[PDB]
Amino acid sequence: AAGYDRHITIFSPEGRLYQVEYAFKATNQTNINSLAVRGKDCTVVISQKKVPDKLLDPTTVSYIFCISRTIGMVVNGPIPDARNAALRAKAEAAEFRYKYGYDMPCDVLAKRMANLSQIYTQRAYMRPLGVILTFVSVDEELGPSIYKTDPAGYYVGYKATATGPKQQEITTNLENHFKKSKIDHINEESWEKVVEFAITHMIDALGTEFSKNDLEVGVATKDKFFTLSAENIEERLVAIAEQD
Amino acid sequence: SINGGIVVAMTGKDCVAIACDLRFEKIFHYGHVFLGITGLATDVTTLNEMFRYKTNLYKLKEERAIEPETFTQLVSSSLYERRFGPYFVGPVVAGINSKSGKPFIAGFDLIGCIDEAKDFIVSGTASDQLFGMCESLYEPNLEPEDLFETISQALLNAADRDALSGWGAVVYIIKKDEVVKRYLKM
Amino acid sequence: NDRHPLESTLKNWETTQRQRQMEQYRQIFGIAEPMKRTMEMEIVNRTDFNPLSTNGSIHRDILLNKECSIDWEDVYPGDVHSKIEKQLGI
Amino acid sequence: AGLSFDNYQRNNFLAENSHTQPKATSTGTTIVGVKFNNGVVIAADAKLHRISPKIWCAGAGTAADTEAVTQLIGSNIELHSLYTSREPRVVSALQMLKQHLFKYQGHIGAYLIVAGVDPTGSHLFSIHAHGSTDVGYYLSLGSGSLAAMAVLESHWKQDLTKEEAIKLASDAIQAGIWSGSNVDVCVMEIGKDAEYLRNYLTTAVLKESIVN
Amino acid sequence: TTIFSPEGRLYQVEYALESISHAGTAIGIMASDGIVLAAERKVTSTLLEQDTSTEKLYKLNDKIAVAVAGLTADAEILINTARIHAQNYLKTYNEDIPVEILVRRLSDIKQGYTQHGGLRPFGVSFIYAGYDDRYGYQLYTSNPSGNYTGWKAISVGANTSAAQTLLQMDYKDDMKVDDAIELALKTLSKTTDSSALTYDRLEFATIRKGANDGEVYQKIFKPQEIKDILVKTGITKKD
Amino acid sequence: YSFSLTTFSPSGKLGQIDYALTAVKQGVTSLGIKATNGVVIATEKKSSSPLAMSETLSKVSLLTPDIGAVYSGMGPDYRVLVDKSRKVAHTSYKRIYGEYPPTKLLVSEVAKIMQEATQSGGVRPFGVSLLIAGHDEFNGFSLYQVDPSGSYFPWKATAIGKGSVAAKTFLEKRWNDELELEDAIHIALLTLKESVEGEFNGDTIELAIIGDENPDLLGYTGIPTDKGPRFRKLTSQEINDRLEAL
Amino acid sequence: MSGYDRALSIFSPDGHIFQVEYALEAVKRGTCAVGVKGKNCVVLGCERRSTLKLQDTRITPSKVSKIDSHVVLSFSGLNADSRILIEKARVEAQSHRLTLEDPVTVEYLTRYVAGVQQRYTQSGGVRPFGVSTLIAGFDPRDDEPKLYQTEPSGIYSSWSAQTIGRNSKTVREFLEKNYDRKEPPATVEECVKLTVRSLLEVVQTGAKNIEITVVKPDSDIVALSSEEINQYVTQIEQEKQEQQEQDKK
């Protein structure tokens, strides 16, 4: 057990903070896979919905959060740690918009949230959250955008980031599409084709078809991030089923 | 002890000058940078203590002496700190860039607005008698001996010609590698 | 009084702006948010004592959202046993 | 910390008891603004200040306070540009300047006309010392502001080019003329560097001792 | 964790004293008309910038200098505190700080970091040097414990014992600063782990009076001046 | 109250800092070289995925218009030090002296921040070594390394991270006291070509210089007094053009 | 609380083997410090360890430290700690007069010193001071000599003679034979002679190692020099030769 090295955020002889490595195993406690992609004028987030008990209300299960008018995120990890980080991200965007007189960029919120994770990653009495945060917006400076943030406080931009315990298959299929298409976004002029494209990739990667209630969707255009209802998802599933 | 008094500052070809009233000089130095302060004598001495401290620490921390323009920014930012209750003073910095050789003179209000006249500077109450004399006697690009002559006659002429037994003036003439302090009496 | 109008306001500005912020977060997000934020600040303030350094702390500027902002209070700032017997109680 | 009141009461007895407190230098002279075609001109008759390369100001009231706030906010704008990796917006500087002028309740006597170009376009605003704000295609402050505003209104039209904006700027300044007294101008144009244009218009007894 | 060993002895102070016992050697010698400081610097790096202005030797004010054995990161915190205290004394009294008041000032801060369990002690030993009118030329030493002592000649850091024996047999109470130059260079060449002494391995300084009655002058030697006292002394690594 | 971290081990060693130098020793290599008329600092960008856009992960950072920095170690520790280092330059020195601090005064202040993290309860020391490089009117060009200890050193050239001992041996073998800035750039590009984990091109490599003043980058004309940024971050096309001269 | 008293074998409570016991061990390892009262003086004396050949004597601190014009303190145990303990007492006394129009009383200089030492015992992972002290002097407007000892635990006591540090058993044994509480040394010279005899039995070599301060009423504080204590040592050694040769056999 090596004493304090494994139980507080302090360096092992090797130089490993066991508090951070273990918090990356917490993010896979949901058994949920999520996928995000950039279109031409939008960015889209598709997330696996698990509702095993008949007794749940599926309208209260959601890993997608509206962070402000223009920005939104999916969370991979426990819902208590996803609601805590969503509430911070909502407050950080609100105070930036007041201080600097313009809407908080996705890049700036991912950096601000990643700087907070570096505290818990150095202070021995602070533990890193058990969540990965996947911010998306249509920034006026960088158009459609995706930024991912993790328990170690490392954040970077992305064009098709994804988090889940089967994320490697989705990512390996995304890399092969971006390798053949050679554009860094999917070239659809309307978000309906982007979401349908994002439900064609998660079907093909996870080896299962999806009902309208077994799927989630997000639609980030300029001036609005919003969540789809099950009938808007079924319009896309119907159009996938009309094509094939 | 006498409150007020005048300081005058002036540029020549590779040289500077700082005249002042005696009868405790208004004019201090911190290496090659000279500071003539007029006004309340307590603030003149408190600023001497404060700039001696800051500039000794600068020399220690930075391995070189504080240059005339850097000292201008330091005196103005230090004076500005005292914004709601300022130093009752008119500081006049002077000095010759040790890496350039250019003459520098600047002066400030009590909260640190920088004048940077390329010819001459005045400070103290009843400045505008000397401002006329100094504008009358000055010419550009003097040698050090003529530069001493113009600043010393400015001090003498604008002097109270009724009390010239109570007179005494210090003129620092400052050059690249040499400083001469002439005391001057009648 | 003879004392400058602005003096008592600027003396307490840092405290007042955070105390006012915590009451907005209580109102908009509920008691859990200022309870979280005050305990983070307690861990950072209480586990960070060094008698020769008074120049704030790096994580407190991250927590307070002061990591890229200068006040006049940051450019114009203002015994080890006396510090020790204040930190521990006399 | 910050601006102190140490000798506030000490100087409340000096002025009462007959020391003339030194005069704070004031720039009371005309300052103007021009939201001209694809940019924005500002001018004053030492007096034009930078918050960043693309955002500039003209100041009136206390000279030290117009420099001091524009340099403090210029520091925060530079740090925020480094923090966000984006060019600093005029609305961000306006928010900082106006929010800083409010903390100080108009005891910092800077009256300021703020202009610049940023990734959104070209903007023009003015802040009074109590921290309250104007916007317009053309603004003027200082004693000549009545006469300057009469000239600004009498000749402004949409698609004013650089040269015509610079003429109107200079005529609204020269309509303030009959410290200061010739034009400095800066021109911010949306694709281009801020163009700054300076002045657009035996006797006595001697003893001596050597010193270091 | 600042608790006593059952003998009434402080483990952390002993471990800080083990740390400085590796930390490079420094000698100071008090002549009848000036003080000499010298320090030996383990330059195992070719790309480290020799002709950097300081590492072992530092000014505290216009008449006080130090040599450092120990962690340079720890030393620089104390050195700044001493510089602030020297100028705060000069500001208060209009007079230059007496050497005893400043040496013991840094000995009171270093004792505090040994009593409170949240603080590790400072891994530094200082050989202070200076002049004042109250005493004259003074040479002091201070160590991680907060102990300080007055000396006529002393070594700190590595090889202290060999150096103290070499000082003791050649030191004279009536010697001049140039005899102390010679002695400190001889002592270091008779104590060094490196094969021979040379100007980049050596940090040097002096506290002389000069020709002019009001002067005391602290030449912290640049490398070329050290090469001259090396070739004059007979250490003379010369073409 | 039995409270501190980084206490002394019986052999006279600080222990926790030693473990903090093992985290530094695991990072993607960075390096720096000083020349007669300029300086170079360089590193590789390691992608967590090829879907990541490493135009967002800058590793080479502007501290003041004449000072640059780069790291090896934990990048999160380096984003937080760089923003304190920027705040320090403005608040301690620019706002008192109307000019930016030298590269010895800013390195001392960064090192003072890392020393305070060793001598504390509650906090681990930093997992980064920083190379800070710059120019000043009286010191001239300079390069320094800062470690988790708060120890700082002036260097002619250095390297830190995985490939650092082979890099430091190449830097000793190639450095001479008459290098110019185009020469030092070539030596730095050669050194990263050996240390590279991934692909070598202008997109994977970070490279910055402090060189001559660039009056183009000041973004406003009319003030010759203001010379314009010495610090310039090489564009990905320049890096690919120099990588064609390799 | 120690040794062979053990019920059903034994086990430890919170109790005796503790930080303060190890501070008492540090005090015993520090040089010998002694004090004796007289009819109208008090003399404090100390052991210097014999100074090294390269040590500087003119600036070496006097071991007996003046806290105020009428109060003197000496110590055994840790020097660094005693320096921090004398600073607190000195400012405490100067502050006493500034706020009470009264110089500090010797008993208030002993309750304060032991009092601050007790707070570093009580709690906090701040260690107690490895120091024990003699505090001696006179109150103002009085001619009674006072002499107190303080210990690392913050216990203090009044003595007409006492010794602390190295070898102090043998010194306290000599004092119990040579100090009569009915008829104490009636003159300063005899008081100093008694302290030089007391120290001569325990010091390393001789007159080098002894140093004494004499306190008298009305702030007459007086360190004795090496040359003055050399004439005491020599007179005592003369009387040893005289006593030996006055053998009758």
From Swiss-Prot, chain B:
Q: Which UniProt keywords apply?
A: Cytoplasm, Isopeptide bond, Nucleus, Phosphoprotein, Proteasome, Ubl conjugation
InterPro entries assigned: Ntn_hydrolases_N (IPR029055), Proteasome_beta_3 (IPR033811), Proteasome_bsu_CS (IPR016050), Proteasome_sua/b (IPR001353), Proteasome_suB-type (IPR023333)
Task: State the compartments where it is located.
Answer: Cytoplasm; Nucleus
Pull one GO CC term from this UniProt entry: proteasome core complex, beta-subunit complex
GO terms assigned for molecular function = endopeptidase activator activity
Give the position(s) of the covalent cross-link described as Glycyl lysine isopeptide (Lys-Gly) (interchain with G-Cter in ubiquitin): 54
The domain of life is Eukaryota
What Pfam families does UniProt report for this protein, alphabetically? Proteasome
User: What is one Gene Ontology biological process annotated in the Swiss-Prot or TrEMBL record?
Assistant: proteasomal ubiquitin-independent protein catabolic process
- Do the record's keywords include Metal-binding? no
Function of the molecule? Non-catalytic component of the proteasome which degrades poly-ubiquitinated proteins in the cytoplasm and in the nucleus. It is essential for the regulated turnover of proteins and for the removal of misfolded proteins. The proteasome is a multicatalytic proteinase complex that is characterized by its ability to cleave peptides with Arg, Phe, Tyr, Leu, and Glu adjacent to the leaving group at neutral or slightly basic pH. It has an ATP-dependent proteolytic activity. This subunit may participate in the trypsin-like activity of the enzyme complex.
**In which family does this protein belong, per the annotation?**
Belongs to the peptidase T1B family.
Q: What is this protein called?
A: Proteasome subunit beta type-3
List the lineage, top down: Eukaryota, Fungi, Dikarya, Ascomycota, Saccharomycotina
Curated annotation (Swiss-Prot), chain E:
The remark listed among the other comments is:
Present with 17100 molecules/cell in log phase SD medium.
Compartments annotated for it: namely: Cytoplasm; Nucleus
Is this entry keyworded Kinase?
no
| Protein name (database record) | Proteasome subunit alpha type-3
Q: Which InterPro entries match?
A: Ntn_hydrolases_N, Proteasome_alpha, Proteasome_alpha-type, Proteasome_asu_N, Proteasome_bsu_CS, Proteasome_sua/b
Q: Which organism is it from?
A: Saccharomyces cerevisiae (strain ATCC 204508 / S288c)
| GO biological process entries | proteasomal ubiquitin-independent protein catabolic process; proteasome core complex assembly; proteasome-mediated ubiquitin-dependent protein catabolic process
Primary localization: cytoplasm
Keyword Glycosyltransferase in the entry? The reply is: no
Can you tell me which family this protein belongs to?
A: Belongs to the peptidase T1A family.
One Pfam family assigned to this protein is Proteasome_A_N
What PANTHER family does this protein map onto? Answer: PROTEASOME SUBUNIT ALPHA/BETA (PTHR11599)
What's in the GO CC field? Answer: cytosol; nucleus; proteasome complex; proteasome core complex, alpha-subunit complex; proteasome storage granule
UniProtKB/Swiss-Prot annotation, chain F:
Cross-link Glycyl lysine isopeptide (Lys-Gly) (interchain with G-Cter in ubiquitin) position reads: 104
List, alphabetically, the Pfam families matched.
Proteasome, Proteasome_A_N
The cellular component terms of Gene Ontology attached to this UniProt record, alphabetical and capped at eight, are: nucleus; proteasome complex; proteasome core complex, alpha-subunit complex; proteasome storage granule
Which GO terms are recorded in the biological process aspect for this UniProt protein?
A: proteasomal ubiquitin-independent protein catabolic process; proteasome-mediated ubiquitin-dependent protein catabolic process
Keywords of the record, alphabetical order, are: Cytoplasm, Isopeptide bond, Nucleus, Proteasome, Ubl conjugation
| UniProt KW Ubl conjugation keyword | yes
Q: Where in the cell is it found?
A: Cytoplasm; Nucleus
Coiled-coil regions, chain positions: none
Listed under subunit, the entry gives: The 26S proteasome consists of a 20S proteasome core and two 19S regulatory subunits. The 20S proteasome core is composed of 28 subunits that are arranged in four stacked rings, resulting in a barrel-shaped structure. The two end rings are each formed by seven alpha subunits, and the two central rings are each formed by seven beta subunits. The catalytic chamber with the active sites is on the inside of the barrel.
Q: What else is known?
A: Present with 7060 molecules/cell in log phase SD medium.
Family statement drawn from the similarity comment of this UniProt entry: Belongs to the peptidase T1A family.
**Protein name (record):** Proteasome subunit alpha type-2
Species for this entry:
Saccharomyces cerevisiae (strain ATCC 204508 / S288c) (Baker's yeast)
Swiss-Prot record, chain G:
Q: Which ranges are annotated Basic and acidic residues under compositional bias? A: 237-248
The protein here is known as Proteasome subunit alpha type-4
Region named Disordered: 235-249
**Which InterPro entries does this entry report, sorted A to Z?**
Ntn_hydrolases_N (IPR029055), Proteasome_alpha (IPR050115), Proteasome_alpha-type (IPR023332), Proteasome_asu_N (IPR000426), Proteasome_bsu_CS (IPR016050), Proteasome_sua/b (IPR001353)
What Pfam families would the database entry show? Proteasome (PF00227), Proteasome_A_N (PF10584)
Family statement drawn from the similarity comment of this UniProt entry:
Belongs to the peptidase T1A family.
Instruction: Output the Gene3D superfamilies linked to this UniProt entry.
Output: Glutamine Phosphoribosylpyrophosphate, subunit 1, domain 1
Name of the gene? PRE6
Q: What else is known?
A: Present with 16800 molecules/cell in log phase SD medium.
